[PDB]
Design a protein around this ligand. Structure first.
Ligand SMILES: *[C@@H]1O[C@H](CO)[C@@H](O[C@@H]2O[C@H](CO)[C@@H](O)[C@H](O)[C@H]2NC(C)=O)[C@H](O)[C@H]1NC(C)=O
Ligand SMILES: *[C@@H]1O[C@H](CO)[C@@H](O[C@@H]2O[C@H](CO)[C@@H](O)[C@H](O)[C@H]2NC(C)=O)[C@H](O)[C@H]1NC(C)=O
Ligand SMILES: *[C@@H]1O[C@H](CO)[C@@H](O)[C@H](O)[C@H]1NC(C)=O
Ligand SMILES: *[C@@H]1O[C@H](CO)[C@@H](O)[C@H](O)[C@H]1NC(C)=O
Ligand SMILES: *[C@@H]1O[C@H](CO)[C@@H](O)[C@H](O)[C@H]1NC(C)=O
Ligand SMILES: *[C@@H]1O[C@H](CO)[C@@H](O)[C@H](O)[C@H]1NC(C)=O
Ligand SMILES: *[C@@H]1O[C@H](CO)[C@@H](O)[C@H](O)[C@H]1NC(C)=O
Ligand SMILES: *[C@@H]1O[C@H](CO)[C@@H](O)[C@H](O)[C@H]1NC(C)=O
Ligand SMILES: *[C@@H]1O[C@H](CO)[C@@H](O)[C@H](O)[C@H]1NC(C)=O
Ligand SMILES: *[C@@H]1O[C@H](CO)[C@@H](O)[C@H](O)[C@H]1NC(C)=O
Lengths: 219, 164, 49, 46, 46
């Protein structure tokens, strides 16, 4: 299936506060009214320039992503996981199952079978959006958690995404996947292009509205 | 090595550590610590917050950033606020007073006395009389109204009477 | 100063812009994030074996 | 109380020009940056 | 002004208007506003 975003995938493109103004930016955005894939419950996707990624549930079936160029050994990759404990970022050379996942006893993690040469570690319904990008050896992640009053369909509205993480890795990326918690006892993928937007800033400094300046003559 | 405590120097064990700094082609990595100093307010200073470099006078403010926002800027894109990275308090930035200086002369063919106007400057930062055109030094403020002789501005004029 | 900027030993009555003025920075300050990753060298330079 | 466009236009023109003057303090014109404290920090005087 | 001396064969490019180097930064400097000639010829036979 395919679906239509309406006004989705807007993130704060810098750390700068702004009071009641209209500011114009050039960056990598998800164009308004786009053609976003639909997935149910998954396969190896491309990256090619950033990614928008939403998801919907009350349980937690979406348990992180895996990135990289080959998703195996012989080249390095990232791995972002969340068991019922908390997030586990990790950067080694792995050996990934071609269909990697984790179970739910509650024993799991048939994800990889190798953790060699680790160069970075870290340990510690609902709509959960994420924007992933990778520039100059930094892997930036923006995110937002809005509550839907549906269970698993893409809604309409405006909600800007706030920066979360910054990782000075150096890693090359060309592909990525997803991770799901099996049954033993809905998600979308947009892509980002270089656009020019007009963001409206509140008096507290939040982005409340935007204009995509390449949609139509009025814009 | 059969090391023994009664060995002449040059046969006793030495421990060695070899540090090797390498620079592949990443975006960055470990560096040395950045020393800082206390923050003073209400004086023209040369500040530096994390790389934000400028000069001016810092006061405390009534803004509220967003937890991830590190400094503010206004229309025309000048920095007019900042967050300091240890208190987590936001501070207003105001340029350090400046202006022009004009001298009021009654004509050198009449006298050698002069008055001086410091344009749009408060009088504290330089008998002494505060106009809306700036701070005026060397002229007496009388209460009568004459025709304008030398225009000062915002309704005020000056003149050489009697002698002053 | 008037005589210099007017290039003349005589000046006539008026008001004349002669120079600018500005306050100079008293000192310098620096701010930076606190320390946390001091990075222990008391394991390689302080090993038991 | 419910037309002064000729007075509004001269205000607008002057403000639009003063803003364009300040917005030019952030162009390179073919230099490495727009800040003198950045050319005086990663370049020798020559 | 004739300034006459002897150097190592490498830092002959260190005698130039405007530069950085261990010979130029410590033992001999020329202004960037230099005007004159620089002559160098080899010597291990003297
Ligand atoms: C930076 O470190 C200093 C201490 O080195 C912290 O200062 C404390 O701040 C709290 C306020 O949250 C005060 O109640 C304490 O009295 C302060 N102690 C000292 C010794 O200054 C400061 O909070 C730290 N800030 C960050 C952002 O880490
Ligand atoms: C290894 O650890 C020891 C002990 O913590 C450090 O020895 C200290 O050295 C300072 C400076 O010479 C003295 O003032 C202290 O008295 C020493 N410690 C004690 C317990 O007396 C030593 O510096 C550490 N080595 C390194 C390389 O950091
Ligand atoms: C998205 O692109 C596919 C490509 O064939 C097309 O079939 C589909 O109709 C498009 N969806 C929308 C909403 O335009
Ligand atoms: C969660 O997964 C990480 C991945 O290595 C692991 O380190 C951690 O121990 C797991 N949680 C528990 C409770 O074992
Ligand atoms: C990465 O792992 C392989 C196999 O374990 C090893 O041959 C190689 O030396 C490792 N890389 C580095 C930089 O040591
Ligand atoms: C990423 O892959 C490209 C392939 O064209 C390669 O040229 C580049 O060096 C790789 N990135 C890094 C940091 O080596
Ligand atoms: C945030 O914005 C709202 C509306 O714009 C305003 O009423 C409020 O005072 C602001 N500050 C808050 C909520 O701290
Ligand atoms: C200027 O001085 C000369 C010489 O004293 C005099 O003749 C002339 O009247 C003066 N001009 C005036 C008073 O306007
Ligand atoms: C000048 O400074 C004084 C001293 O704080 C202040 O009270 C006053 O409001 C300022 N402005 C004028 C026009 O006096
Ligand atoms: C000018 O007149 C006012 C009347 O309100 C008075 O308060 C003030 O002291 C007078 N100043 C002088 C210098 O006479």
């Amino acid at each position: 299936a395919y679906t239509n975003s309406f006004t989705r995938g807007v993130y704060y493109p810098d750390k700068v506060f702004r009071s009641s103004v209209l500011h114009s930016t050039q960056d990598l955005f998800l164009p308004f009214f786009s053609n976003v894939t639909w997935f149910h419950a998954n396969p190896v996707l491309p990256f090619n320039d950033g990614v928008y990624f939403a998801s919907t549930e009350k349980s937690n079936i979406i348990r992180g992503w895996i990135f990289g160029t080959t998703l195996d050994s012989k080249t390095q990759s990232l791995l972002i996981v969340n068991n019922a404990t908390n997030v586990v970022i990790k950067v080694c050379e792995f050996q990934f199952c071609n269909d990697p996942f984790l179970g739910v006893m509650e024993s799991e993690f048939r994800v990889y079978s190798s953790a060699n040469n680790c160069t970075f570690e870290y340990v510690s319904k609902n709509l959960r959006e994420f924007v992933f990008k990778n520039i100059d050896g930094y892997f930036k992640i923006y995110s937002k958690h809005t509550p839907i009053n549906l269970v698993r369909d893409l809604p309409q509205g405006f909600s800007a995404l706030e920066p979360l993480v910054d990782l000075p890795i150096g890693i090359n990326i060309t592909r990525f996947q997803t991770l799901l918690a099996l049954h033993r006892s809905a998600y979308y993928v947009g892509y980002l292009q270089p656009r020019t937007f007009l963001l409206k800033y509140n008096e507290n400094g939040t982005i409340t509205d935007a204009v995509d300046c390449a949609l139509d003559p009025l814009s | 090595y059969g090391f023994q405590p009664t060995n002449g120097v040059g046969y006793q064990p030495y421990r060695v550590v070899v540090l090797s700094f390498e620079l592949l082609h990443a975006p960055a990595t470990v560096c040395g610590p950045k020393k800082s100093t206390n923050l003073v307010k209400n004086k023209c200073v040369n500040f530096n917050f994390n790389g934000l470099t400028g000069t001016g006078v810092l006061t405390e403010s009534n803004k509220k950033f967003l937890p991830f926002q590190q400094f503010g800027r206004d229309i025309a894109d000048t920095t007019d606020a900042v967050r300091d990275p240890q208190t987590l308090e936001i501070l207003d930035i105001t340029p350090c007073s400046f202006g022009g200086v004009s001298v009021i002369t009654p004509g050198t063919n009449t006298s050698n006395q002069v008055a001086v106007l410091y344009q749009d400057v408060n009088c504290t930062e330089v008998n002494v009389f505060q106009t809306r055109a700036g701070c005026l030094i060397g002229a007496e403020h009388v209460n009568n109204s004459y025709e304008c002789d030398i225009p000062i501005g915002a309704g005020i004029c000056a003149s050489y009477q009697t002698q002053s | 100063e008037t005589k210099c900027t007017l290039k003349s030993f005589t000046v006539e009555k008026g008001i004349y812009q002669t120079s600018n003025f500005r306050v100079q920075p008293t000192e310098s300050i620096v701010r930076f994030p606190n320390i946390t990753n001091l990075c222990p060298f008391g394991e390689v330079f302080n090993a038991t074996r | 109380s419910s037309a002064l466009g000729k007075l509004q236009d001269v205000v607008n023109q002057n403000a639009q020009a003063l803003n364009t003057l300040v917005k030019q303090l952030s162009s390179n014109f073919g230099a490495i940056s727009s800040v003198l404290n950045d050319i005086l920090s990663r370049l020798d005087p020559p | 002004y004739a300034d006459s001396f002897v150097i190592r064969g490498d830092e002959v490019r260190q005698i130039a208007p405007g530069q950085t180097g261990k010979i130029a930064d410590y033992n001999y400097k020329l202004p960037d506003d230099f005007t004159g000639c620089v002559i160098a010829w080899n010597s291990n036979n003297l």
